[PDB]
Every structure is written in structure tokens, then in C-alpha cells.
């Protein structure tokens, strides 16, 4: 019935929410704007994007945010007639500190205009809101320990949230320290039968990842741990195509069934490599998957052992499928950018990105370079398949090497490749390749660049991704294409390749314009094509 | 008569400006807020702070800015009855790119309300506005080349500025590539006798720094180089107490005398070390110095070789000294903080830094860690002498290790030391030392932290700097002091120690409060003392 | 009945050999001289050193050998009335190459003058000699692939050795490529029932280490792999005190029982640390353990699951205990140094190390520094316990800072600590601490070294090791002891801490003398004590 992952490409930190017979997953968006994606389903198999809640600077201001900063795992719940969304803005992602803030916004409907944030606390990420039977509300999050002699993951902190006062009240208490896996995060609370169940993520979001669960009769513990913990992990299953299984959330359907959504990474093919030495590279980042649960002696169990199954049986409901929500060839005739497109850190106004200046075109006025955490004229969508083609057609007339426009495959400010139009003193208007690998830049077509003929209005730019490797090609007519003589490697656009380990996103493909002279020179993109192959 | 440096501690990129018999110097402030510091003098010997122009968000918004980003060398000039101030907001300081923006603001007076900014260009830093004899206006700045096979310093660009239209007009053109020293920056135009003189900086701002001068009868050149170039350098003079002499600007006095202001580094004592292996560590960063000029066959010459003299002869005017503009022991008696105090990146509002919550105290509401480029509750002043004592007295009751308050010696987010009050599970409220060295944190007193007794209202914190080393000490009563058994080295808070090369500021000393839990806990500082020794 | 590890401290690559009811284990010695240790047992429980075969330069010349080069896993067998020992001299241990040569030496008795080496091949380390029932002899070893785009572990090469001709004959052929674990290493061949069994080490000698076994009816393959492979591994057992379980060799007893000897690492205690993030630091290096086997459908199985047991049941033989073979307090009254003492790389003559010069003393004439891979006057023994005291008493009169003598805890040339006597210009003869971490040297008592009175003939030096930490102490009278106030960490002398990953030995403790001036100055050591707890 259901083949995993249900949300492919960059979809980490899934939070699942039942409202009667409708089902929602919110996922993390990190430095990508707007913040948070929410998908809806009737059958837990087919999913459509229904909301992008954090779209006002008053809710989310990420200017200058570090790569993999911003919106970490969000938490979606529904109570007292409305949806409650908890989210982070993480400012510091390397070193002894992890400075970041937790906020609450609400809405009566999933896709309405959500409130402005209520500040909660800053003590650690992965905040979650629990709505207890007695009407009381409680916030759980991880508690961060910066000290040199200590492990940073101090445990799970709980504090009561007063709806009326719009603040946490009483005193914060640590209710759980974790198991020896440590790196205890992603807390979620569930009242099931006579117990409070505390779900956590442990072992860290790489290959040691796990979901741990514990129970207590008191909300403040002590929590006894599942006798066969972890509840879920891929660590002991180095051949399982789904790796890094953890950061889960429990759903109890109206049909009286139990399911567990979680993140996972799907490494590239590794045949010929030591099984255990390095466990793989995931260009699609961390994706969302689902597992069935069954109950024994008051403990849930992942059906089919504690590793993730590639295929599961969905709940006992009618299949409800959805119509495709993007054009394979986006001609840019719409009056609002398709909802699979996102921007870096900030909203781009009409002065930077516009469908109005030239109907049928996305116009990007040139801003800062691909290494800037501030203002980039860059519109991009997720790699969502191992095998795909992406294509654009652009008119751009640069007058200086400081200006560029092109097709970009992008992980972060220091890790990307592009096929771009720029200008050269002797050759004039040119096509080139450019890579950035940990801030180190290469120009592979150095002194060998494609001269673009004066009479050519539109350059056609394409990338063809074939799992491990990909290639850029170009055309001056849309019919006759020419390969550029460089093979690129997808593993360099993956979480696992990044040396900082603040690497929580996934690969994007998009359209970029830079004008480092500040002459407000723009590029006109006639269309954007993305097609699974 | 005049002993260099004239402006001590962090004072780089000096821009001198004459208005009648009044003399102004504008210096760069980088990430420190508010932006730009302007000093006034009557004799060029004695200098007083009179303006801090960039104090509104509309003019300067630096949240998230990299360390040593922001306001690089500024340009101050006077024409048509008003002051003209050109400044940068530099966003990228590492890698192939140096993304940054150039802005103009004006004021009828030096210390009034400066206009909101007019956007100029982004083609490169070190902007300077030239006021030609015909009433036409011209902007010069360096032109940035990002390409792998290229030297970044493409030379000096020039473009006319239209006052009426509030933008640059016509086509920008390179007017000078520089000499073989390269790293051509800090361009300044002067129309003297029959020639346009172009003053630049070359060799980079380290020990190869120079001031280059060229001339032409045509504004657009080509320019011919001084026959005994450079005009000023420290490179050939390893025994000079003033290194890195470059980035100059020229003044013509009302007494028909000529002077050259420039930046300089003052290395710490390095006796018994190889003269040329490593030329030193400057914790006071780049300071401002002044050289006399003489003329020979249409070319200016620095009086006493092209190396910087430690002492010069002032201009033919009566000496005007200024009263001390701060208290050695600042009791926080005003309704405003003393103007030697700055904040990181952003203004701090009363919600973070206030003299109104506890009379005669600076209260700091705890924000993010010392490693955050966003919101730090931190108020600091420059190290301005090699030997000094600094001290503060603070009331603070932390309820968690996520909370701290202390005395901080600080270079950047990743380089600093501190004597701070925090909380410990066993020991309760404690004093500890903490250092950060390229993001790597040490706690020198780990396991032996100072227990602060419950009846102590105030803890006194002191640093005593003695050139190459410094020590922290504490007191519970203000009378009996105890040294902490750790000697710190001042070279670790110096330009030359930082391994990023983007190290353009200097050491500061100040008061910090962090609340990582987000409970809005605060510290009350009764006084802040700074005293030269 | 038998408690693991059976061979404690640095004892890797064990090769077990049965001769009647006599059992022998040979282990690797790498850069430590003489080469190879052979231990004897009657019961497989109690083990005593009986031979150090490679004691002549014709056999083993290792001057300048890199750290963790030289004698890797040896192979010991018995056939046709004599003992056969196969060994390596590995010359290159980092990079694409692993340059090293395999040699064969023989002896009629375990402890006799072994022959001079017969050169065998150079194609890869882990040589092993197999004696087929029909009286033919074949050499197995790993085949090394240096190529950029290739996994370096090509598989197992096999070739017949001609006894008469003193050389290998025929064509070499690959009989096994390995499993997906790769890093296929440590080949041993056995003829059991109708099958040849090929035992290998896979997964590398760190935490993914395994014992792999396969079978064929032909010597040359193909080999079908054990259906529940690995035969032995610690990888899935992160809580097991015995880690890195692998590099096995099989023994069939005279009692018709089956056991497996293997290497193992015991990580230091790491309570509070994430279970899986980093699996530990092993200052005792790789030790020798023993497991029991049983048979099932023509395949051997480790009794107690495929992980290693801490305690096993020994073979049904009468126990034979051995006398302690060293003095807790070695007064140096013997004619030869105790056989638990080794030297680095080369044997030392009476001109360097002598028990004869001063009666009741070991005299070491000072040679080169602790960072020298050539001539060190160094005599050391293994750390063999997590808790121990080691102690010496030394007479030394340095006349220059170039001269030192002391007590050393030593991993390799770039990683060690010492308490040592040297000379200072003002203070004179002093006691100091020195450490070396990846070639980086520190002196934690600089400016506060202990002045040794001129009337003191002997300085007493002690180290007390307590698992994760150790402390040096001293005495002038041998009754009153002063701790030096520095706490050292044992993990810095562990396999796992070393960056090069050529880290194949373990911590030693010993006596050193340097004379960097070449004046042949010496130190007289009165005793050396080593005592568990
Ligand atoms: Ca179109
Ligand atoms: Ca006061
Ligand atoms: Ca003796």
C-alpha cells in the first residue's frame, strides 16, 4: 500500500497531526523561506502541500542566518478549535553554543493567516506542545549544556504553558535524561491508557539515529524506558536502503490504528565500498517515512522489527489521491510563484523577484553572490528524485564579470555548482561552469568558455541528474543540445559531505542572478522545467 | 610636538577633512554599533569624539554580519555647505567574493541628524567621493575581481555622481591598476596645482602595507606613479615601533602646511625573537597616526624618509587640549551610556540595556552567547593602552548554567576570554574563567570553580593588562582581592593571531550578560572602571 | 575458567600453534625490538613468554622504521619436525602504498637460534604459511592495490612455496576477494573434513573489525562464505567490554576441542558519553583474547553468539600455572634485562644500555630525543593494566638543557609524556614535566620546575595510572612523595587518539636518557618497579 519515503527530498523533522479524519505533516525548512511546509492526506499514502505558515518577517526574520540555522524541526498539534505550531529560529549552529529561540503561532485553519509569534523560551531546540486531558498545556524541548566537561544534550525539559497569560508559568523541570545513546532530542508527549509516553530522538541525526520511547504515570517522571529500546533505528541494518531512522512522531488514526512518521536518509549506491567504513551520502537530505505500530504489554513496536520497512500497509480507509500541483514545464504565466519554489532566508519582493515586469517571465534583479547569507536573487526547488532533468531558458546581457545568471545546484553558501552566463574582457558574453566546495571555488571551463553569439536572445540551460553523477548541457535554440565536458558528483551536494556537520537540509536546483556592480542588471527566465526520469 | 598614534586602539581607515580651521577624522567601526566615529581637533595633536553618525537602522543594519564585516574605511568630506559621508556595509569577508554595498549620507553639521542613505554601488569597498572644481562629483572605489585565475584587486574605478538625481551616472571606468605591490585599495582624489592626484593603498593592510600616489592632468588618467614610490610604508623598517603604515589621506591646513594621516599597527614587545620571521601581534589593532609632508617637483614627500616617524612637528597653530570625556570610574550616573561604549552589530533598546531599571546601574537583560553574530547583551569599550586596569561590580543571581554575566576581553565571536558568574548543580552560584580560541572553548578552573556565598549582593571583577600578558581577579566585598591562578596572553586578542585573515578590529573590554534559557534574567552593573597604568 | 584478554596490553595479530599438548601464540611487535613475542601454554588459560625470535639484524633491521611499521601480524606454524615463523618488515604505513616485505625463518625448537630469513614476496602484509596434508606448502597474504579509484584490499593471494628451492613457485592467484565488509586481511588456511577453510579479518582493525570464514573443496576456490558470517565481531555489540573483535586464528586441541584466538581493544570507561558516537580509547592497544568454537553443518560457530565472551570454558586438561617471570621491584642485579623490556627499532649495545657499568643499576648512555626513529637510549615495558604504579630511582647529573633522563609514558615518537631531570641556566639541575601530542610539545611546569638540591644523589620518579587519568610524583628520599599538580589523560596514549591511523601498538612505560650534546653523559637507574593497582 505505502512505499517509503512519503515526502522525498529535503523533508526533515516530521510532526504529524490528526484532526478527525484529516492528516497533516509539518516539516523543517531551516534557512529556506517561507518557513515550514505542511502536507495533508486522507490515507497516509498520498500527500499534498497545503500550507507554508511562516511567511511574514514578523513571524520569521532569518537575515544572516547560518546555513542549517533557522527553522529546525517544527511541531504541529490541534486543540481547542485551532492549530498550534511551535517553531525555532536557530542562530548559532557550531561550537559549544546552539543559540536559538522557540515560538508559538496559531490558526483556526491549516492554510489561513497564522498569528504573530508568542515567545516561549530559548533553552534548547525541538520544542513540542502537549495538550493534556485536564485542559492544561505543557512545553517540552531539549535542554542545552554548553560546558566543555559535559555532553550538550542535558535532557528533556518540561514547563506549563498558560494560554491566558501567553507565557510559560511555574518552574522548568528536567523529566528525562535519555539512554546511553544520548544526543536526546525531539521530545513528544502522549497520554495513552494510564501512562504518559515520552518519545525522543537519540544517537544523533546521522547513522546512529534512533527513536526511543519511555512511559510514566506522572507527567514529571520517572520514565521507564521501552524494554526493547530503541523503538526504531537503522544503525544495526547497514544494508537497509532507508538509513538514519529516528526523530519520529506517533499517530493514532480514527480507524483505531497506530503509525509512526520519522526522518530517513537514502544513501547513493555504494557497491564496491566497505559496508561499514562510511555509510553513505544523501543528496536528497533527510526525507519523511512512515511505519506501522502494534501494541504489546503497554509498549508500542514497529511492525517488522525495529528497523524501517521500505513498504508498509496503510490504514483501513479509501485511497484518496491528489492531482499534480506543479507543471513539469513552468512557463511563468501564473501570478504567484509555484509553491515548490523557495528563497534563501528572506522574502524576495517585486524589486528582486517579479512575474510582473515581463509577463510570462520570472525576472531576477541581480543581488549578492552564491556565498552570501544575506540577499541572493535566487529561486530554487528541491531535488526530489535520484534521477531527473531540470531546465531553464534565460535572457541575460552582462556588461562585467561581476554579473552572472544561471542554473544552480545548491546545498549551501559554500557548497554548490552552476552553469552561468557572465562577461569576459576578450570573449564578451560567455557560458561557464563554476563550483564551490567548502568555499573553495573552481572554474572547470577556464580559458575554454562557450562564447555566446551577439544575436542569441535566450540561452537554454540544463542539468541531467543520474544518481551518483550529473552533467550540465546548453542550447542556443532549444532543439540542439551540447554537453559540457565535466562530470559532477552528487555526493558533494549531500548532508554527509559537509565538514561542519551543521548540514541538515538537502540539494536544491534553481535560478540565480548576481550583480556585484550594483547596476540592478537582471535576468529573465522564460520557464523552469523539472521532470523525473 | 605630536606623538603617534594620535588615536589609540581600534581606529582604522582614517579619513581627514578640513572645514576652515577645524579638523575632522572619520574612522571605520566594522561590526561595532553605532557606525563610524568622528574626532575633532584644532591643532591635530589633541582629539575629541564629536560624532557617531550611523545610529539608525535605516542607515546601518548589521544583524548577522560577519566578524570584521560592516563599516570598512569611511570617507568624510565637506562641500556645498554640508558634510558628505561615504560608507560600506560589507556582507562577505572570506572566499572569492567580498559582497558589500556603498552608501552616501549627509549633514549640515558634524553632530546633527545625518540623512537616510543614498545607495551608490557595490562594485568594491573603500568608496571615496571627490568634489571637483567645476561642481561635478565623482566616486572612486576599488573594483573586485572574484575569478580563480585572477588577482582580486582589479584597480580603481571611477563614476560621476549626480547630486540632483541622487545616483551615479554615465559609465564606470578603471582609471588605475596600481603598481606591482598590487592589493590596490583606499583610493582618494585630490586636485592640487595642475594635477589630479590619486592616493591609494597597496601591499595589503599587514606588514607589506604602503601608501601609493599617482598623478594626471586628466581625471580619467592615465596616471603616472611617484618616482620614489611608495609615499609611505613600514615594510623596509622592521625596527620601527609603528608597522603597517598605509591607507592614508591628505590634509592641506589653513596654515599652508601638509599632513598625512594613516593607519598603523603597534606590535607587542617581541625581544629575543627573529626580527623578520613574524613581525608581531597587535591587540590594539590598527590605530591612527599622522605624518608631515613636504613638496618636491610636484610630488609630496613624507618628512624623514618614507617610513613613519613616531613624533612629528604639528601645524603652526596654538595648542587646544580637550577635557576628559569619560570617568576613570564610570558610575553610570547619566541617562545615556558613555560614548566610548559600543554594542555588537545592533542598537540595544531598553528591553536589553537600560539605566532606568535600577538607578545608577547599567542593567543588562541576558541574551545570546558570546559566539552569536545576532543579539548579544554586551556593552564594551576599546583597549586603548598596552598597560591598564579594568573593573566592574555586578549583582547577578543565575538559576542555571545557561545564564552568565561577566567581564569580557573580546576580539570577535570566536576569540575572547571572560571572568563570569554562572550557576552549578552542586556549587550553586559560582565564578569561573572561560576562553574561546577560534571557536574552541576552555574552562581553566573546571572542577575548581569559586563558590559565591548567598549573602553576597555584588561580585567585583577585574582585569589587569600588562602588555604581553594579563590576569583576572575578584572580590566579594570590594576591598579584599584574589587573583585567579591563570595568566592569559594578549596576543590571542590581536589582529595577527586570527587565522581567517578577516581580522580588522582590535581588543575590547566590557560587560556581558547571557540568558540561554530565555527567562529574561538580568545583571546590574554598578560601575565600569577603565584606567591606564 | 578462562578470563579475557589472555594476553594483556599491546598483543595484536595473535597466531596460535599447537604441537602435541604444547600451545604457542605469536604476536606482533611492530617497531619494538626484538621482533615477535611467543607465549606458551598447556591449558590455554595460563601463558608465559618463551621466545623473542627476531633478535639479530640479519633477521630484522628496523632503523628509521616509521611508527607502527616493522613487524605486523606474524604467522607461527609447526611441520616436518620444525617451527615455521612468517613475518613482515613494513616500511610505509601512510598514503596509497604499504611497502613491506615478507620473510620466513625456521627453528627446530621454539626458543633456539632461529635461521636467517628466506625472502618470500612483497605483495602485501599478513603472510601465512599453510601445510597441506599431501606435503605441499602454500603462502597466503593480502594483495595490495595502490590505485586511486580502487579499494586497497584486492583480496587474498595464494602461492606454493618450494621447501627445496627456498622460494615461491608457479603463478600467484587470487582465491578470495572478500565480503562487502571489505578490508580483507589476515588470511589463514585449514583443511577440515572435505573442505579447505579460509579465515580472514575484514572491516578493519577498529570498531567494524570482524572474523570472516569461507570454505571450498579446492584450494583455489571458489570459496562459499559462512551462512551467518561474521564468525566473530564486536560491531553489533556496543556495550561489550571487548571491542574490535577480529584477526582470528583457529586451534584444534589434542582434546578434540576447538578455540579461536583473536585481537581485541578495551575502551577506557566512558560513562556519560554517547554509546555510538565514538566507541572509545584503548591505551592498552590491541590485546589477545580467546573464544570457544563448536561445529554445525560443516561450519564453526563461536560459542555464546558471534560476539566475544569475556569468560569462556577452557579445554578439558589439568591446569598448569606459571611462576611470575619478573620482579615487581627490579633491582637490576641480573646479568640481562628482564624480557618484558624492549627497545625502539634496534638492539642497544653495552655502549648505550648496560647492567655492567654500575652494579645494581641499569646505565643508559644518552643518545637522541624522544622524537627519534633512529637511536634512542630507551628501555620500556607495556602498560598491561588500567590501574598500576610504575616507579624508578635515578642518578643523573646534566650539564646542559640538551641532556635529560626520566620516566616516560610513551605511545610513539610524536605522542608521549615524561617526568625528567634536566639542566637550567639559573636554577641548575631541575625536575620537569614534558608532553608531546602529535609532535606538539608542552612543558606544564615551565617557570615552576622543582629544584634538585646538589646533595641529592637519587631522584625517585613515579607514575600512578588510574584508568582515564594518571599523575606523576617524585621524592628525594624515597619515603615522602610529592604529586606534581598536573593531571594527565590516558586516552592521549591510545590507538584511537592518533591521527595518522598507523596506530597499531599501545602504551609503554620506561626509562630514558638523552644526550643531545654527544658528550656520552649517562643516567644510573637503581630500580624499576611495575605493580598492578
Ligand atoms: Ca514563459
Ligand atoms: Ca552606580
Ligand atoms: Ca639496584
Yes or no: say if B468 and B443 are a contact pair by the CB < 8 Å rule.
no
Name residue, grid cell 641499569. Answer: C362
Q: Which residues of C touch A275 (CB under 8 A)?
A: 179-182, 203
H or E stretch covering C120 = strand C118-121
Local structure of residue C71 (DSSP, 8 states): B
| Residue (of C256, C255, C257) closest to C291 by Cα position | C257
Instruction: Report d(CA C136, CA C157) in Å as an integer.
Output: 17
**Number of structural domains, chain B?**
2
Residue C507 C-alpha cell reads as 602504551
Pairing of strands A22-27, B75-79: unpaired
| Residue (of A173, A182, A175, A15) closest to A88 by Cα position | A15
Q: Cβ contact (<8 Å) for B149 and A443?
A: yes
Instruction: Report d(CA A368, CA A518) in Å as an integer.
Output: 9
Instruction: Report d(CA B416, CA C180) in Å as an integer.
Output: 48
Question: How distant, in Å, are the alpha carbons of A283, A465, A478, A486, C457 from that of A473?
Answer: 21, 11, 11, 10, 82
Yes or no: say if B296 and B286 are a contact pair by the CB < 8 Å rule.
no
Question: How distant, in Å, are the alpha carbons of A186, B139, B230 from that of B156?
Answer: 54, 10, 17
Residue C182 C-alpha cell reads as 571489505
Yes or no: say if B338 and B356 are a contact pair by the CB < 8 Å rule.
no
Taking residue C25's Cβ as centre, other Cβ atoms within 10 Å add up to 25
Instruction: Report d(CA C410, CA C392) in Å as an integer.
Output: 16
Tell me the three-class secondary structure of C282-330, residue by residue.
Answer: CCCCEEEEEEEEEEECCEEEECCCCCCCCEECCCCCCCCCCCCCCCCEE
Instruction: Report d(CA B73, CA A70) in Å as an integer.
Output: 32
For residues C253 and C402, membership in a common domain is answered with: no
- Provide the Cα torsion C248, C253, C258, C263; round to 10°: -20
Taking residue B204's Cβ as centre, other Cβ atoms within 10 Å add up to 17
Pairing of strands C258-265, C286-296: antiparallel
Name residue, grid cell 578455540. Answer: C259
For residues B264 and B349, membership in a common domain is answered with: no
- At which of B276, B300, B325 does a domain end? B325
Beta-carbon contacts of residue A89 (< 8 Å; ≥ 6 apart): A60, A61, A62, A65, A69, A70, A71, A100, A101, A103
Q: Is the dihedral of CA B350, B352, B354, B357 positive or negative?
A: positive
- Residues written for chain B: 533
Angle at B328 between CA B348 and CA B528, to 5 degrees: 40
Beta-carbon contacts of residue B180 (< 8 Å; ≥ 6 apart): none
Ligand 2 geometric centre to CA of C216 (Å): 89
CA C48 to chain centre: 15
Instruction: Report d(CA B411, CA B505) in Å as an integer.
Output: 7
Q: List A76's β-bridge partners, or say none.
A: A85
For residues A347 and A305, membership in a common domain is answered with: no
Residue C160 C-alpha cell reads as 606454493
Q: Is the dihedral of CA B405, B411, B412, B415 positive or negative?
A: negative
Taking residue A319's Cβ as centre, other Cβ atoms within 10 Å add up to 10
CA A147 to chain centre: 29
Name residue, grid cell 520569521. Answer: A60
For residues A331 and A245, membership in a common domain is answered with: no
Domain that holds residue C335: 326-533
Yes or no: say if C412 and C65 are a contact pair by the CB < 8 Å rule.
no
Neighbours of chain C (3+ CB pairs under 8 A): A
H or E stretch covering C105 = strand C100-107
Yes or no: say if C83 and C76 are a contact pair by the CB < 8 Å rule.
yes
Beta-carbon contacts of residue A257 (< 8 Å; ≥ 6 apart): A292, A315, A316
CA C134 to chain centre: 35
Yes or no: say if C16 and C293 are a contact pair by the CB < 8 Å rule.
no
For residues B432 and B531, membership in a common domain is answered with: yes
- CATH assignment of the domain containing B169: 2.115.10.20
Beta-carbon contacts of residue B403 (< 8 Å; ≥ 6 apart): B366, B422, B423, B514, B515, B516, B517, B519, B521
Neighbouring C-alpha atoms within 13 Å toward the C-beta of B29: 25
For residues C297 and C338, membership in a common domain is answered with: no
Q: Is the dihedral of CA A326, A327, A329, A335 positive or negative?
A: negative
- CATH assignment of the domain containing A439: 2.60.120.200
Residue C280 C-alpha cell reads as 572509545
Taking residue C336's Cβ as centre, other Cβ atoms within 10 Å add up to 7
Instruction: Report d(CA A368, CA A517) in Å as an integer.
Output: 10
**Cα-flanking dihedrals φ and ψ of residue B427, to 5°?**
-80, -10
Q: List B301's β-bridge partners, or say none.
A: B294
Instruction: Report d(CA A420, CA A444) in Å as an integer.
Output: 12
Question: How distant, in Å, are the alpha carbons of A267, A414, B49 from that of A493?
Answer: 12, 10, 50
Beta-carbon contacts of residue B531 (< 8 Å; ≥ 6 apart): B328, B329, B388, B389, B390
CA A146 to chain centre: 26
Beta-carbon contacts of residue A416 (< 8 Å; ≥ 6 apart): A370, A408, A409, A410, A435, A436, A493
Residue B11 C-alpha cell reads as 581606529
Instruction: Report d(CA A2, CA C99) in Å as an integer.
Output: 53
| Residue (of B97, B453, B72) closest to B286 by Cα position | B72
Residues of C with CB under 8 A from a CB of A: 151, 179-183, 203-204, 208, 235-236, 239, 272-277
Taking residue C426's Cβ as centre, other Cβ atoms within 10 Å add up to 5
Instruction: Report d(CA C254, CA C41) in Å as an integer.
Output: 13
- Provide the Cα torsion A55, A56, A58, A62; round to 10°: 60
Angle at A138 between CA A136 and CA A141, to 5 degrees: 175
Q: List A422's β-bridge partners, or say none.
A: A430
Q: DSSP for B435-490?
A: EEETTEEE-TTTT--EEPPTT---EEEEEEEETTEEEEEEESSSS--EE-S--EEG
In angstroms, how far is the first alpha carbon of chain C from the final one? 23
| Residue (of C52, C117, C63, C65) closest to C86 by Cα position | C117
Instruction: Report d(CA C85, CA C64) in Å as an integer.
Output: 24
Ligand 2 geometric centre to CA of B387 (Å): 25
For residues A58 and A203, membership in a common domain is answered with: yes
For residues C330 and C317, membership in a common domain is answered with: no
The closest CB to that of A443, out of B64, B148, B515, belongs to: B148
Q: Cβ contact (<8 Å) for B516 and A64?
A: no
DSSP, collapsed to helix, strand or coil, labels residue B8 as coil
CA B204 to chain centre: 17
Angle at C276 between CA C275 and CA C278, to 5 degrees: 100
Neighbours of chain B (3+ CB pairs under 8 A): A
The closest CB to that of A92, out of B95, B146, B371, belongs to: B371
The percent of chain B in helix, strand and coil, each rounded to the nearest 5, is 0, 45, 50
| Residue (of A378, A369, A371) closest to A518 by Cα position | A369
Instruction: Report d(CA A375, CA A63) in Å as an integer.
Output: 8
Q: Residue ranges of the alpha helices (H) in B373-451?
A: none
Instruction: Report d(CA B83, CA B77) in Å as an integer.
Output: 6
Beta-carbon contacts of residue B80 (< 8 Å; ≥ 6 apart): B131, B135, B163
Tell me the three-class secondary structure of A421-489, residue by residue.
Answer: EEEECCCEEEEEEEEEECCEEECCCCCCCEECCCCCCCEEEEEEEECCEEEEEEECCCCCCEECCCCEE
| Among chain A residues, CA nearest to C271 | A180
H or E stretch covering A295 = strand A286-296
How far does C399 lie from chain A, in Å, by closest CA?
A: 42
DSSP, collapsed to helix, strand or coil, labels residue B495 as helix
Instruction: Report d(CA C65, CA C385) in Å as an integer.
Output: 28
Ligand 1 geometric centre to CA of A419 (Å): 20
Residue C343 C-alpha cell reads as 627497545
Name residue, grid cell 643531545. Answer: C516
For residues C274 and C385, membership in a common domain is answered with: no
| Residue (of B366, B395, B388, B369) closest to B509 by Cα position | B388
For residues A320 and A333, membership in a common domain is answered with: no
Resolution (A): 2.2
Helices (H) and strands (E) in chain C, counts: 0, 41
Instruction: Report d(CA B138, CA B143) in Å as an integer.
Output: 15
Instruction: Report d(CA B300, CA B477) in Å as an integer.
Output: 60
Answer whether the bond into residue C34 is a cis peptide, omega within 30°. Answer: yes
Angle at B163 between CA B162 and CA B169, to 5 degrees: 10
Yes or no: say if B101 and A517 are a contact pair by the CB < 8 Å rule.
no
For residues A284 and A408, membership in a common domain is answered with: no
For residues C292 and C398, membership in a common domain is answered with: no
Ligand 1 geometric centre to CA of A330 (Å): 8
Q: Which residues of C touch A203 (CB under 8 A)?
A: 274-277
Yes or no: say if C235 and C207 are a contact pair by the CB < 8 Å rule.
yes
CB pairs below 8 Å between A and B: how many?
A: 136
Residue C158 C-alpha cell reads as 595464494
**Cα-flanking dihedrals φ and ψ of residue B322, to 5°?**
-115, 145
Ligand 3 geometric centre to CA of C358 (Å): 9
Yes or no: say if B170 and B160 are a contact pair by the CB < 8 Å rule.
yes
- At which of C325, C350, C384 does a domain end? C325
Angle at A37 between CA A36 and CA A39, to 5 degrees: 145
- Provide the Cα torsion C192, C194, C200, C202; round to 10°: -130
Q: Cβ contact (<8 Å) for A275 and C182?
A: yes
- Residue B221, Ramachandran bin (φ over 0: left; ψ between -120 and 50: alpha; else beta): left
Yes or no: say if C202 and C213 are a contact pair by the CB < 8 Å rule.
no
Pairing of strands B210-216, B232-233: antiparallel
Instruction: Report d(CA A43, CA A78) in Å as an integer.
Output: 19
Q: Cβ contact (<8 Å) for B146 and A401?
A: yes
Instruction: Report d(CA B463, CA B533) in Å as an integer.
Output: 12
Answer whether the bond into residue B230 is a cis peptide, omega within 30°. Answer: yes
CA A184 to chain centre: 21
Instruction: Report d(CA B21, CA B425) in Å as an integer.
Output: 63
Give the determination technique. X-ray
- At which of A276, A291, A325 does a domain end? A325
Instruction: Report d(CA B508, CA B32) in Å as an integer.
Output: 10
Give me Rg for the CA atoms of chain B: 24
Residue B384 C-alpha cell reads as 586603548
Name residue, grid cell 611441520. Answer: C79
Residue A531 C-alpha cell reads as 521532470
Instruction: Report d(CA C386, CA C490) in Å as an integer.
Output: 9
Q: List C263's β-bridge partners, or say none.
A: C246, C288
Give me Rg for the CA atoms of chain C: 24
Q: Which ligand lies nearest to the CA atom of residue B528 in the structure?
A: 2
Amino acid at each position: 500500500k505505502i512505499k517509503n519515503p512519503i515526502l522525498t527530498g529535503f523533508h526533515p523533522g516530521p510532526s504529524i497531526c490528526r484532526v478527525g479524519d484529516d492528516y497533516y505533516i509539518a516539516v523543517s525548512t531551516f534557512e529556506w523561506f517561507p518557513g515550514v511546509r505542511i502536507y495533508h492526506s486522507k490515507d497516509l499514502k498520498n500527500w499534498r502541500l497545503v500550507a507554508r505558515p511562516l511567511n511574514r518577517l514578523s513571524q520569521l526574520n532569518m537575515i544572516g542566518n547560518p546555513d542549517s540555522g533557522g527553522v529546525w524541526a517544527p511541531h504541529l498539534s490541534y486543540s481547542d478549535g485551532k492549530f498550534w505550531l511551535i517553531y525555532t529560529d536557530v542562530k548559532v549552529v557550531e561550537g559549544q553554543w546552539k543559540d536559538g529561540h522557540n515560538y508559538l503561532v496559531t490558526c483556526d485553519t491549516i492554510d489561513g493567516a497564522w498569528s504573530d509569534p508568542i515567545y516561549l523560551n530559548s533553552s534548547g531546540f525541538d520544542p513540542s506542545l502537549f495538550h493534556d486531558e485536564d485542559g492544561r498545556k505543557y512545553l517540552v524541548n531539549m535542554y542545552w549544556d554548553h560546558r566543555v566537561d559535559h555532553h550538550p544534550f542535558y535532557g528533556i525539559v518540561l514547563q506549563e504553558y498558560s494560554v491566558e497569560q501567553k507565557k510559560l508559568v511555574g518552574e522548568p523541570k528536567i523529566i528525562f535524561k535519555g539512554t546511553d545513546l544520548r544526543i536526546t532530542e525531539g521530545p513528544h508527549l502522549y497520554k495513552i491508557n494510564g501512562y504518559y509516553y515520552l518519545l525522543t530522538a537519540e544517537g544523533g541525526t546521522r547513522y546512529n539515529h534512533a527513536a526511543t520511547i519511555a512511559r510514566s504515570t506522572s507527567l514529571y517522571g520517572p520514565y521507564e524506558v521501552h524494554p526493547d529500546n530503541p523503538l526504531l533505528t537503522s544503525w544495526p541494518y547497514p544494508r537497509n536502503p532507508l538509513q538514519k531512522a529516528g526523530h519520529a512522531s506517533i499517530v493514532h488514526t480514527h480507524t483505531d490504528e497506530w503509525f509512526l512518521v520519522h526522518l530517513t536518509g537514502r544513501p547513493l549506491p555504494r557497491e564496491g565500498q566497505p559496508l561499514l567504513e562510511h555509510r553513505g551520502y544523501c543528496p536528497l537530505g533527510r526525507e519523511t517515512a512512515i511505519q506501522r505500530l502494534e501494541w504489546k504489554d503497554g509498549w508500542p513496536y514497529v511492525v517488522g522489527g525495529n528497523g524501517p520497512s521500505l513498504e508498509i500497509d496503510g490504514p483501513s480507509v479509501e485511497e484518496v489521491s491528489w492531482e499534480k500541483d506543479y507543471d513539469e514545464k513552468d512557463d511563468f504565466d501564473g501570478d504567484t510563484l509555484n509553491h515548490h519554489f523557495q528563497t534563501l532566508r528572506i522574502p524576495l519582493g517585486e524589486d528582486i523577484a517579479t512575474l510582473k515586469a515581463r509577463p510570462g517571465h520570472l525576472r531576477l534583479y541581480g543581488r549578492e553572490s552564491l556565498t552570501s547569507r544575506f540577499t541572493q536573487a535566487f529561486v530554487a526547488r528541491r531535488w526530489q528524485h535520484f534521477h531527473f532533468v531540470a531546465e531553464t531558458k534565460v535572457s541575460f546581457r552582462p556588461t562585467t564579470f561581476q554579473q552572472s545568471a544561471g542554473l544552480v545546484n545548491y546545498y549551501n553558501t559554500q557548497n554548490w555548482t552552476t552553469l552561468q552566463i557572465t562577461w569576459h574582457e576578450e570573449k564578451g558574453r560567455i557560458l561557464e561552469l563554476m563550483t564551490c566546495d567548502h568555499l573553495v571555488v573552481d572554474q572547470p571551463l577556464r580559458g575554454r568558455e562557450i562564447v555566446v553569439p551577439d544575436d542569441i536572445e535566450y540561452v537554454y540551460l540544463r542539468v541531467t541528474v543520474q544518481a551518483t553523477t550529473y552533467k550540465y548541457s546548453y542550447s542556443f535554440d532549444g532543439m540542439n543540445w551540447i554537453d559540457l565536458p565535466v562530470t559532477f558528483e552528487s555526493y558533494k551536494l549531500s548532508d554527509d559531505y559537509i565538514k561542519s556537520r551543521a548540514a541538515f537540509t538537502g540539494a536544491f536546483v534553481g535560478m540565480h542572478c548576481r550583480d556585484g556592480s550594483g547596476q540592478n542588471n537582471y535576468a529573465d527566465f522564460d520557464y523552469f522545467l523539472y521532470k523525473e526520469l
